Design a binder for this molecule. Structure first.
Ligand SMILES: Cn1c(=O)c2c(ncn2Cc2ccc(CC3C(=O)NC(=O)NC3=O)cc2)n(C)c1=O
Length: 497
């Protein structure tokens, strides 16, 4: 069921972790809670004590700002009046949300919300939804100015910057996104959507499963406030390796066709197969790896409030999100299963020991395009950025938990992408744990190539130069896919030398 290094020999957080420094705000680290009062098992206290507002192009525009206006009245006062009404039928909730979104009263479809409430839920489940969950969501949404008291900077392009906030603050913000209260988000063309209006549209059979997953989270965090923190870090590198000259050896590999990144990769650097707009279609139509992870760990979704579209040299690293739901299936078969009791330990900043990196692979309209050297180097550098932790010893780096990044809809070749990730992890001095989700032949193929290359002592540079040879000798002048596939080429090239 698995091959390579036993997964028990791979490094995992928290045990491999370095001692964290004292949490403190700085020019490159926004911290929205009182660090002097951070205590295990206690709800973090916001800093500052009273709400402070910034309404500009460098920060989130909060719905509770005095500058949030509507024809001139306070839009926040209007939001409060709209949402503080009894809901008893789904049209009530549609009408409430549109009271402060009048310009979208014809554009925004709520069919999936109406159908979930009227045509999917049983009567008692609907009753719990509108008598308990929705009012509790309103109340934490309207509590926003007492909870998120500090302006949140945008993580804009080329910024190296972290935001550390409480799970409770994220809950209040996500409740606002659900009720579609974020102004000017319906100057943000380079940011993902944040308001949930596209979750309410259409008749996809997966919308009830998305809604069940999110309401599971909203029921949990409004019933009992979570006590931990989450860190969002935008990382962009200015210097990338000279891959052809890299003399580093390959690291260890565990590869398996069973298990999942989230369950079996606990304490490891977990890859999110991201869209450059992070989260992809989580609050619209998509439901593959990235969207599933954003639904079962919804605190990931708030990255869309403040994370600008990723450039080629950038990633987003999120530490501390909690798993609230279990699921079955994938894509068209995804179903919400039950609530999840996250058993991850917390670090000395009270963050769950769960580290997720969003890295976006390229979309290849034509299969052979991905073997062009600039396109291979692009993917190597993206993965490297996602894996590198500058100034951390290899002993304190967990293994990378990943799989067929960019394959499927984006057209990536699984065997090439496996090799690219292996090279990037080697250069970042991390081991690899690779999940092939049922593809046992791919498991065997990746293991066999990895052991071949390691037993022959080939460096990262040795391998990269073979990839260039493959392009130049089998791809560049190809007429049709090439006659010879990548791994057969590599075997023949190395063995004949
Ligand atoms: C990353 N990862 C997986 O690869 C995975 C998985 N469970 C099964 N698989 C394998 C797999 C791969 C491709 C498709 C096709 C496809 C579709 O049929 N319909 C769409 O809409 N999109 C699509 O890509 C389905 C299934 N889990 C939990 C996971 O995390």
């Amino acid at each position: 069921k698995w091959l390579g290094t036993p997964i028990e020999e791979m490094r995992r957080m928290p045990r491999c972790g370095i001692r964290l420094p004292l949490l403190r705000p700085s020019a490159n680290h926004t911290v929205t809670i009182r660090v002097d009062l951070l205590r295990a098992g206690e709800v973090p206290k916001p800093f500052p004590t009273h709400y402070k507002d910034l309404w500009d192009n460098k920060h989130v525009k909060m719905p509770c700002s005095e500058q949030n206006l509507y024809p001139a009245g306070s839009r926040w006062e209007l939001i409060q009046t709209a949402l503080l009404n009894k809901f008893t039928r789904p049209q009530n909730l549609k009408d409430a949300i549109l009271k402060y979104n009048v310009a979208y009263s014809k554009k925004w479809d709520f069919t999936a919300l109406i159908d979930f409430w009227d045509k999917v839920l049983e009567e008692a489940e609907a009753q719990h939804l509108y008598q308990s969950i929705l009012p509790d969501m309103v109340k934490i949404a309207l509590c926003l100015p007492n909870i998120c008291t500090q302006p949140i900077p945008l993580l804009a392009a080329a910024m190296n910057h972290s935001i550390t906030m409480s799970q409770e603050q994220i809950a209040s913000l996500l409740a606002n996104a659900f009720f579609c209260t974020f102004p000017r988000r319906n100057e943000y063309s380079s940011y993902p959507d944040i308001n949930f209006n596209r979750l309410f549209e259409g008749r996809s059979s997966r919308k009830p499963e998305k809604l069940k997953t999110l309401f599971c989270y909203f029921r949990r965090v409004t019933a009992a406030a979570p006590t931990g923190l989450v860190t969002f870090t935008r990382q962009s590198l200015e210097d990338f390796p000279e891959w052809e000259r890299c003399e580093k050896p390959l690291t260890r590999l565990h590869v398996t066709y069973e298990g999942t990144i989230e369950e079996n990769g606990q304490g490891m650097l977990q890859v999110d197969f991201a869209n450059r707009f992070v989260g992809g279609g989580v609050t619209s139509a998509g439901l593959v790896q990235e969207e599933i992870r954003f639904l079962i760990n919804p605190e990931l979704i708030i990255s869309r409030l403040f994370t600008e579209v990723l450039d080629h040299n950038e990633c987003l690293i999120i530490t501390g999100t909690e798993q609230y739901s279990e699921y079955t299936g994938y894509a068209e078969t995804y179903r919400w299963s039950r609530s999840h009791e996250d058993g991850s330990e917390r670090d000395d900043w009270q963050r769950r020991c769960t580290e997720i990196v969003a890295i976006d692979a390229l979309h290849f309209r034509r299969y052979l395009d991905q073997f062009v050297p600039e396109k291979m180097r692009r993917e190597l550098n993206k993965a490297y950025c996602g894996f590198l932790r500058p100034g951390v010893s290899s002993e304190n780096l967990s293994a990378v938990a990943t799989g067929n990044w960019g394959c499927g809809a984006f057209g990536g070749d699984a065997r090439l992408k496996a090799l690219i990730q292996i090279l990037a992890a080697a250069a970042a001095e991390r081991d690899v744990v690779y999940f092939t989700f049922g593809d046992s032949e791919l498991m065997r193929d990746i293991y066999s190539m990895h052991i071949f290359l390691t037993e022959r002592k080939l460096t990262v540079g040795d391998v990269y130069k073979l990839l260039l040879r493959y392009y130049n000798e089998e791809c560049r002048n190809c007429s049709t896919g090439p006659d010879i596939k990548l791994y057969p080429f590599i075997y023949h090239a190395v063995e004949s030398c």
